[PDB]
Design a protein around this ligand. Sequence first.
Ligand code: 3L6
Ligand code: MG
Ligand code: MG
Ligand code: MG
Ligand code: MG
Ligand code: MG
Ligand code: MG
Lengths: 177, 177
Amino acid sequence: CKYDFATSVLFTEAELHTRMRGVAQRIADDYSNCNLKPLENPLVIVSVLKGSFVFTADMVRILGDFGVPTRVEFLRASSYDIRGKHVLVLEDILDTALTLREVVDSLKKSEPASIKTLVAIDKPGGRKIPFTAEYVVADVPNVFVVGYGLDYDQSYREVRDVVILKPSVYETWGKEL
Amino acid sequence: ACKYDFATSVLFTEAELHTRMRGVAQRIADDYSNCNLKPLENPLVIVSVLKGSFVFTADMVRILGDFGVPTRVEFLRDIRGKHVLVLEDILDTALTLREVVDSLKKSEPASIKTLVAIDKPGGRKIPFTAEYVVADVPNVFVVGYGLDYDQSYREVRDVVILKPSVYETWGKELERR
Ligand SMILES: NCCCN(CCn1cnc2c(=O)[nH]c(N)nc21)CCP(=O)(O)O
Ligand SMILES: [Mg+2]
Ligand SMILES: [Mg+2]
Ligand SMILES: [Mg+2]
Ligand SMILES: [Mg+2]
Ligand SMILES: [Mg+2]
Ligand SMILES: [Mg+2]
């Protein structure tokens, strides 16, 4: 494997960007009847920090390529006007769904015109409540991943690919802690 | 002819900014070589000033990772004994960064430096020099690469001079509303 801290690479940066262009085309098509425009009516991106920052940076650039103008707002995951505006929530990983359920219900109180969710990584086997994201870039099974914004104890977010961290790394680090 | 109808000039393309960022990343790698940066045990702490810096921050931590500089990220709207690098998209009057740097010094980091994507040297209201600067721009109003006009245009991949038509038009529509 190309990283000595990783057992395997699940999605390279290039593969994630290909998938993201596929999702962006669907978003462009799905919002084409909303008459989105810079300044007057952008799609509001609500990005859940910290882990979404890389995905959010790349995805707003790809959405602009596909003609979807955006403005960004940031929330913190550790915490967990859009009235009349279309809102798309971006999260790095969706697993139990407890975070996004609370995020979405909270934003729904401000009466956005619509609210949808876009996640980079879905773990569909992890749900503690039923939840479906409208847009998913990739699925993973029951494995612990880092990279592309996703951390282990605040490290490895900058790895360009989504990878499985090897147990040797985190078992050791729990012990040193 | 400028490839954006809302701009009069492209000042820095995405490719030009990344080229410059690789050059800066090499300098940072050399400068911190005697710091023994490592994931988990001793990452470089990146303190990113939102909102505008999220694109620069996403791209720069990945480039730093390529040059062997592991990071952890914090976003501003414990560091004692850690090396801190503050990232801001644009440095103009320097009033923001002066206040950020002085606030962080109160926590006794091992060191603190700053890295800006765009320096506007002719904008200062107090003296301030960033340790690392990706690009300098004259005294003109730019958008793109995280930088907004009234929360739009951050997703433009290049740094561009905003066409006066855009803010005259929007200024009038606001005064209406
Ligand atoms: N919107 C907010 C941040 C304002 N910062 C940047 C404001 N600013 C200053 N110059 C520019 C510019 O050219 N384009 C854009 N989009 N913003 C600009 C101030 C930085 P500093 O004066 O404290 O050093
Ligand atoms: Mg592709
Ligand atoms: Mg799809
Ligand atoms: Mg999250
Ligand atoms: Mg988390
Ligand atoms: Mg900034
Ligand atoms: Mg601004």
